[PDB]
Amino acid sequence: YFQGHMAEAWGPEAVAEAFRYATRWFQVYVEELNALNVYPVPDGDTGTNMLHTLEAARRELDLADTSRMDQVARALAYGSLLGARGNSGVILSQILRGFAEALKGKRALDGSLLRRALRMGAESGYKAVMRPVEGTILTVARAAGEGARGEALEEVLETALEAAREALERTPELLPVLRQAGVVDAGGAGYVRLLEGMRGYAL
Task: Give 66 or 93: the residue with its C-beta nearer to ligand ADP.
Answer: 93
Closest C-alpha among 34, 85, 30, 28 to residue 57 = 85
Q: Which of 13, 27, 31, 41 binds ligand ADP (CB under 6 A)?
A: 41
- Let me know: does 192 contact 168? Beta carbons within 8 Å: yes
Q: Which of 28, 40, 169, 176 binds ligand ADP (CB under 6 A)?
A: 40
How many whole angstroms separate alpha carbon 18 and alpha carbon 36? 26
Residue 95 assigned ligand-binding role: no
Q: Is 188 in the site for Mg ion (CB under 5 A)?
A: no
Burial of residue 26 (number of CB atoms within 10 Å: 0-12, 13-18, 19+)? buried
The residue sitting closest to ligand ADP, measured at its beta carbon, is 187
Q: Is 45 in the site for ligand ADP (CB under 6 A)?
A: yes
Q: Is 173 in the site for ligand ADP (CB under 6 A)?
A: no
Q: Is 132 in the site for ligand ADP (CB under 6 A)?
A: yes
Residue 34 assigned ligand-binding role: no
Stretch that binds ligand ADP, among 11-19, 53-61, 101-109, 131-139 (CB under 6 A): 131-139
Is the Cα dihedral 48, 83, 167, 195 positive or negative?
positive
How many whole angstroms separate alpha carbon 129 and alpha carbon 165? 22
In the DSSP assignment, the letter for residue 104 is: T
Stretch that binds ligand ADP, among 11-19, 20-28, 111-119, 127-135 (CB under 6 A): 127-135
**CA dist list (Å): 170 to 42, 50, 137, 143:** 20, 21, 12, 11
Q: How far is the CB of 67 from ligand ADP (least distance, A)?
A: 34
Q: Which residues lie closer than 8 Å to 10 by C-beta, 6 or more apart?
A: 18, 108, 109, 110, 153
**Which residue ranges make up the site for ligand ADP (CB under 6 A)?**
37, 39-41, 43, 45-46, 49, 86-89, 91, 129, 131-133, 136-138, 185-188
Going by the annotation, the residues of the binding site for Mg(2+) are 37, 43, 45
Going by the annotation, the residues of the binding site for ADP are 49, 87-88, 131, 133, 137, 185, 187
